[PDB]
Enzyme design. Sequence first.
Site, PDB file in Angstrom:
ATOM      1  N   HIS A  30      68.239  50.567  43.119  1.00 58.49           N
ATOM      2  CA  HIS A  30      67.634  51.573  44.054  1.00 58.49           C
ATOM      3  C   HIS A  30      68.256  51.582  45.461  1.00 58.49           C
ATOM      4  O   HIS A  30      67.893  52.506  46.220  1.00 58.49           O
ATOM      5  CB  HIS A  30      66.095  51.433  44.176  1.00 58.49           C
ATOM      6  CG  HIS A  30      65.608  50.394  45.139  1.00 58.49           C
ATOM      7  ND1 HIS A  30      65.007  49.210  44.718  1.00 58.49           N
ATOM      8  CD2 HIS A  30      65.624  50.351  46.486  1.00 58.49           C
ATOM      9  CE1 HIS A  30      64.677  48.483  45.767  1.00 58.49           C
ATOM     10  NE2 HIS A  30      65.059  49.159  46.868  1.00 58.49           N
ATOM     11  N   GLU A  54      66.852  47.330  37.533  1.00 58.18           N
ATOM     12  CA  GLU A  54      67.042  47.167  39.003  1.00 58.18           C
ATOM     13  C   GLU A  54      68.253  46.293  39.344  1.00 58.18           C
ATOM     14  O   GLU A  54      68.496  46.117  40.536  1.00 58.18           O
ATOM     15  CB  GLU A  54      65.769  46.643  39.662  1.00 58.18           C
ATOM     16  CG  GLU A  54      64.844  47.748  40.147  1.00 58.18           C
ATOM     17  CD  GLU A  54      65.330  48.473  41.391  1.00 58.18           C
ATOM     18  OE1 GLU A  54      64.556  48.537  42.374  1.00 58.18           O
ATOM     19  OE2 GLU A  54      66.483  48.987  41.380  1.00 58.18           O
ATOM     20  N   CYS A 139      66.611  44.389  50.224  1.00 57.52           N
ATOM     21  CA  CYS A 139      66.906  44.587  48.781  1.00 57.52           C
ATOM     22  C   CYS A 139      68.419  44.476  48.550  1.00 57.52           C
ATOM     23  O   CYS A 139      69.216  45.020  49.357  1.00 57.52           O
ATOM     24  CB  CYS A 139      66.293  45.876  48.248  1.00 57.52           C
ATOM     25  SG  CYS A 139      64.482  45.795  48.162  1.00 57.52           S
TER      26      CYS A 139
END
EC number: 3.6.1.15
Lengths: 172, 172
Positions: A30, A54, A139
């Site tokens: 993402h 992910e 992230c």
Amino acid sequence: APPTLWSRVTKFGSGWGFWVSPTVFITTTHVIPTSAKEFFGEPLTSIAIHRAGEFTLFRFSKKIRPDLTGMILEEGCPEGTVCSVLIKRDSGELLPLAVRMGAIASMRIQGRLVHGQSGMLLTGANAKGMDLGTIPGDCGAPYVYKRANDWVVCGVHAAATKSGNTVVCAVQ
Amino acid sequence: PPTLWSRVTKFGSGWGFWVSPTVFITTTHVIPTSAKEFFGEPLTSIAIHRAGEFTLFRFSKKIRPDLTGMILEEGCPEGTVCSVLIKRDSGELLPLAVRMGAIASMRIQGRLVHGQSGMLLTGANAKGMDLGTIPGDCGAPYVYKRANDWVVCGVHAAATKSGNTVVCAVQA
Ligand SMILES: O=C(CCc1ccccc1)Nc1ccc(O)cc1
């Protein structure tokens, strides 16, 4: 954590990625810009992209980071390994967040369904906030641990709970 | 963007913590023994309050007007999980969870130290990872969140060879 692992942590899209070798770059799915057609001077057509939810791995046709040696990437770590998440924050501050790793889980974090290796922060009782815990900007930051002399990397930061006490490591 | 980490400052043989614009706290044994001024202010105009291994400096002008006043208390309740805010010369920030116990006089590597006892929650040995303290860390602060407020409750005074046991020096 060794200077050589911090040198592999590269600012990428809305988060980060990690150089495993001169040709292998891993990130959190993402954080990749959805329209991007070129990475480090190379077209999409010249790059091998393996995606599992992910976790995304990019393998190039030539050495982007020849300053680097290939290191070990594994599908998560044993239950109860203590890892560092190698987090870069504002002003050349480096935040190696201690986490105790648990089991492979499927969860709902703020509406989104996440799957990976769950862990609990060893930074304080309430990790919520940027002083003791993670932010959405972290992230793609790698999960690493030392074993017999060498260092291993075993996933990338996918998510953290409302409370911040639980994190999820996307794995290969 | 405010931050606790901005209050942790290199000082003598270790570190200290800005409680407010005029109030700095540190570990007594890290303070320089030969000095005329500290943060540009001549010792002339500095109140020094020593309690064993806990020293408080009150300045007669605002050294850090960018800061608000924080809650300082004389230790914390038993079983409170605090965070020790360790800064390294590497540029690393290392917040470690510690379980605070009773006020005690402890044999720590030969010497006797009086303060609040705590146990690191990272695991019995840090074997090369950023999971424990080093002598250079002394003066780092003990903090925890309580409602909407950060409380600081003292300074890193000592740790055992194994690194399991730590002493937080407290106001009194
Ligand atoms: O689990 C924790 C500490 C967990 C904890 C964090 C914050 C507040 C309360 C508790 N440590 C551990 C490390 C290594 C081991 O081998 C065993 C335990």
